[PDB]
Design a protein around this nucleic acid. Structure first.
Ligand SMILES: [Mg+2]
Ligand SMILES: [Mg+2]
Ligand SMILES: [Mg+2]
Ligand SMILES: [Mg+2]
Ligand SMILES: [Mg+2]
Ligand SMILES: [Mg+2]
Ligand SMILES: [Mg+2]
Ligand SMILES: [Mg+2]
Ligand SMILES: [Mg+2]
Ligand SMILES: [Mg+2]
Ligand SMILES: [Mg+2]
Ligand SMILES: [Mg+2]
Ligand SMILES: [Mg+2]
Ligand SMILES: [Mg+2]
Ligand SMILES: [Mg+2]
Ligand SMILES: [Mg+2]
Ligand SMILES: [Mg+2]
Ligand SMILES: [Mg+2]
Ligand SMILES: [Mg+2]
Ligand SMILES: [Mg+2]
Ligand SMILES: [Mg+2]
Ligand SMILES: [Mg+2]
Ligand SMILES: [Mg+2]
Ligand SMILES: [Mg+2]
Ligand SMILES: [Mg+2]
Ligand SMILES: [Mg+2]
Ligand SMILES: [Mg+2]
Ligand SMILES: [Mg+2]
Ligand SMILES: [Mg+2]
Ligand SMILES: [Mg+2]
Ligand SMILES: [Mg+2]
Ligand SMILES: [Mg+2]
Ligand SMILES: [Mg+2]
Ligand SMILES: [Mg+2]
Ligand SMILES: [Mg+2]
Ligand SMILES: [Mg+2]
Ligand SMILES: [Mg+2]
Ligand SMILES: [Mg+2]
Ligand SMILES: [Mg+2]
Lengths: 50, 52, 88, 118
RNA sequence: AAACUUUCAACAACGGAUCUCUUGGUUCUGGCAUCGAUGAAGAACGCAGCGAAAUGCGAUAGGUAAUGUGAAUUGCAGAAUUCAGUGAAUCAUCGAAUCUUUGAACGCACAUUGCGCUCGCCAGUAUUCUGGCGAGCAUGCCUGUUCGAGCGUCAUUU
RNA sequence: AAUAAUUCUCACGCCAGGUCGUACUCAUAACCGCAGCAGGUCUCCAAGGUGAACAGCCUCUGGUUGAUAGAACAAUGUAGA
RNA sequence: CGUGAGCCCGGGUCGAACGGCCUCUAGUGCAGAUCUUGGUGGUAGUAGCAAAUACUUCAAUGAGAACUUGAAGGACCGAAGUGGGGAAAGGUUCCAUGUGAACAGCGGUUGGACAUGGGUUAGUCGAUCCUAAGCCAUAGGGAAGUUCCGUUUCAAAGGGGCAGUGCCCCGUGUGGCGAAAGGGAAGCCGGUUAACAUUCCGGCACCUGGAUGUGGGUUUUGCGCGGCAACGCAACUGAAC
RNA sequence: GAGACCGAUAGCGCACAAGUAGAGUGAUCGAAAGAUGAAAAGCACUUUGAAAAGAGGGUUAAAUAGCACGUGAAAUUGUUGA
RNA sequence: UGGUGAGGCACCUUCUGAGUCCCCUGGAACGGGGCGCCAUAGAGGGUGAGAGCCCCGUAUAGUCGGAUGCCGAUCCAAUGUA
RNA sequence: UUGACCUCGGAUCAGGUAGGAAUACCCGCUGAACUUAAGCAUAUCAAUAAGCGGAGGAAAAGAAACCAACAGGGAUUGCC
């Protein structure tokens, strides 16, 4: 809601910075296995559970 | 706002008449500092801040 | 009408976030966590759920202080400086 | 270096000019952060940490000297171990023995002996 | 006769079996005894030149001090003065520190970044008001200190 | 108070007002129902005509023209007769 | 080759280990268990993509246009709306720029999709304050204990004044949580952004708290006058109870 | 420190960003997923296409190893041949 | 009753053997053939394929050191309250 | 009036201590049913699982109000 309860608003800030794709330069690190962000979250797919 | 107002005085020697604060959705804090009418904010940003 | 119609009336949020365990299991009316049992001093866990203890046990976090205890013991809890270090 | 400060140089300073160094270092990092928005910032960040550690080191060393002959010391200066070790009986209290027991130890202690030699 | 259906082979598909491996598991044996109110285990939020996670760390934040090694890190420029260096490194050791908000969690609460009280310093005409900074204020119990209560009770004055 | 005090419940004059929320949807696509599901989910504002009337029907302000489309018109259907 | 389980060889692919014989050993032989896990068929280009009246012309963009955009025409919701706002809930879906694949059960140049940036400004709105139903401490009492009852009791319970201590006064009685719809101090108009507005800008106000000056009022038998009265006036002392 | 153990449907649920992603109001439930090559040498350049890509050409011992990557069975499918 | 300690344990820490000799296959010898060497070391791992001698380590001691505390073998000091 | 003593209190008085984590093994309390008996109720499972309290590197026990009946052994613990 628009009434946010600052503790809750602090979790929402964490959730949107975490929802980013992986930098390109990580895919070239001489022994890398990381290929794509497997913890991607979308508001139409999965609930944050707050 | 009291800490922000005093910080600007000691840091860049800025006299403000009011300050309005935000908390952006990413978690940081914004602060609109309204300068006194007898000083040029554009002039200050060029010299003290380097925001030119 | 106990199915699809009744699920539309469900916007009440029985359980909220807990300060101690960070789970959405703090009952809002009872003010008691359903996971760690937090109105109380003693963390909640039972021997009839081996998985529940495993998820909550000592090796599952940062170990901000116990990780250093092992090294301190192996050297016998030293104090001081290594025999003439730079600077007092 | 340009932004780096060597630990050896700071150890020879005093508290007054270490604080002046700290304030002057913090000012540059503020200006460099502004210019960043519009690599030396890493050097300045470590230099600030380096100066703060040495200032604290000089404070606690002087404090330990002051409390050298005091019965009670601040919990920061008291030696930290396991709390179980801190509750342990002291060496003086552990080595203390009854008067009657000492009389059976000064006379009739364990003897160094051997067999099959006579 | 072609088409279609069925069978086989070659090649090409779909799929990931089989073979070989393995910084993993499992069981046995040997040695050791070390969490926490000097604030633990756990939780939340942050910190990188360019990072989402993992790992590490806490506003001194992918870390400082100290010691040892001795020329790196690496995906790109950035360190070339760090080349006698009085010393690189995501190195090893680790005895000095830092350690945000919490949590047994301790001013009262907390579904609130809420509401308080005491002392000290600084500024605003300020012992009382306002702001900033620092140090504090839980409960039970123990020893002692000091201030008391009770015709419980002793002696004297009276 | 008789030589100055005094009500600062009269007028004017001086200083300050900390912390957190504030975007957007609120639904035949932003909520719940495994979904961009004909379901369900609290409330405020409420024009003109006809008409007893926030009945039905038509229109204004505002908003849509979104729901796989094209061609034929057999049986059997579903809905309207 | 062998009755047979199987063994051996030739041809093709492949790139790092493997086999015979004698003993020892076992998690040692599959067609089924509505067996388990993974993968794949016929059905089958089949059922189907039919509620909410409905679309058409031109032009532009573009490789590509029924479902992009502009204009024109035709319609629907018809104010208990398909409109304008919010509470709960969601969490960046908001705005701009750009776009290969995937998603939008047809397409897509379009998008609540994807990528990069930007966006939420308060003394006056709300929370914060109060208490309600109710919940939890304290004193106590149970219970082997985790804990249960208790909320004023069979408690030595607290709150203020004067100059880190001293001296006074009162006491019947002594905690907290609990409402973004209850109670409650105080802000309106105009303008402004791609995205905010009772929050920014301009003007004009209001409340609370603290200090404190001028003017005015009262008072030389110390704390105002007027009206028959209902009452009036700019003030016009007021401690505990 | 070892093994007459298991060898990626086995061995712990986890050989991997595993008590993770995800489900449930909650107590709790809980996966799948290893292997190019010695070395990225991870296909320059030309041409067709709007583009994805294709065809030449090149790297390699090998692309009958092209990141959908060691080998590549069967079910099922396409072409050719009988 | 005090003393003085060898070292002998317990702690870590530096150092200690021998081919990259010739030919063939191979992209690359760690393969095959020949000629040698070390071994108190032919456990294990890496290196472009099966490596004792290419590299780390592995086997015996003994040396470059230093932290602390446990034990005794020789020797030297004394004295009686109660 | 003053000074003692006894008992009961206050204090952000000076100095301390307890809680929580962990619980594989250890010391206690509490405490089932499935199951066996070819049924079932005592019994058995079992003085076990779950629950609660408390420690350590081990814990507990431990130097006989013991065992014996013998020509007598001689704290505790563990194995056969
Ligand atoms: Mg604000
Ligand atoms: Mg309801
Ligand atoms: Mg036949
Ligand atoms: Mg707003
Ligand atoms: Mg709004
Ligand atoms: Mg909105
Ligand atoms: Mg609406
Ligand atoms: Mg949904
Ligand atoms: Mg659901
Ligand atoms: Mg009418
Ligand atoms: Mg009508
Ligand atoms: Mg449809
Ligand atoms: Mg190979
Ligand atoms: Mg079997
Ligand atoms: Mg089989
Ligand atoms: Mg089978
Ligand atoms: Mg079957
Ligand atoms: Mg059809
Ligand atoms: Mg249908
Ligand atoms: Mg109405
Ligand atoms: Mg509405
Ligand atoms: Mg949009
Ligand atoms: Mg589609
Ligand atoms: Mg398409
Ligand atoms: Mg209670
Ligand atoms: Mg309240
Ligand atoms: Mg309210
Ligand atoms: Mg808007
Ligand atoms: Mg204004
Ligand atoms: Mg008057
Ligand atoms: Mg090959
Ligand atoms: Mg291959
Ligand atoms: Mg393959
Ligand atoms: Mg086949
Ligand atoms: Mg039976
Ligand atoms: Mg039976
Ligand atoms: Mg029965
Ligand atoms: Mg048990
Ligand atoms: Mg004992």
């Amino acid at each position: 809601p628009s009434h946010k309860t600052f503790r809750v608003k602090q979790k929402l800030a964490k959730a949107q910075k975490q929802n980013r794709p992986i930098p390109q330069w990580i895919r070239l690190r001489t022994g890398n296995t990381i290929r794509y962000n497997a913890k991607r979250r979308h508001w139409r797919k999965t609930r944050l559970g707050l | 706002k009291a800490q922000i107002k005093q910080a600007l005085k000691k840091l860049y020697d800025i006299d403000t008449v009011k300050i309005n604060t935000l908390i952006r959705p990413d978690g940081s804090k914004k602060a609109f500092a309204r300068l006194t009418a007898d000083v040029d904010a554009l002039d200050i940003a060029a010299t003290k801040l380097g925001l030119v | 009408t106990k199915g699809t119609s009744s699920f539309g009336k469900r916007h009440t949020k029985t359980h909220g976030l807990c300060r101690r365990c960070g789970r959405r299991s703090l009952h809002n009316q009872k003010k008691v966590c359903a996971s760690c049992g937090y109105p109380a001093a003693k963390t909640r866990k039972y021997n009839w759920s081996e998985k529940a203890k495993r998820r909550k046990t000592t090796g599952t976090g940062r170990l901000r202080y116990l990780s250093t205890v092992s090294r301190k013991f192996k050297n016998g809890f030293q104090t001081g400086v290594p025999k003439g270090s730079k600077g007092p | 270096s340009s932004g780096k400060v060597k630990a050896g140089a700071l150890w020879s300073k005093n508290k007054d000019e270490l604080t002046k160094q700290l304030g002057e270092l913090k000012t540059e990092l503020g200006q460099l952060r502004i210019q960043k928005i519009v690599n030396k910032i890493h050097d300045l960040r470590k230099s600030i940490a380096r100066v703060l550690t040495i200032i604290n080191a000089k404070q606690r060393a002087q404090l330990r000297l002051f409390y050298k002959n005091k019965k009670y010391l601040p919990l920061d200066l008291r030696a930290k171990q396991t709390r179980a070790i801190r509750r342990r009986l002291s060496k003086e209290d552990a080595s203390r023995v009854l008067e009657k027991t000492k009389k059976r130890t000064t006379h009739f202690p364990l003897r160094k002996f051997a067999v099959k030699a006579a």
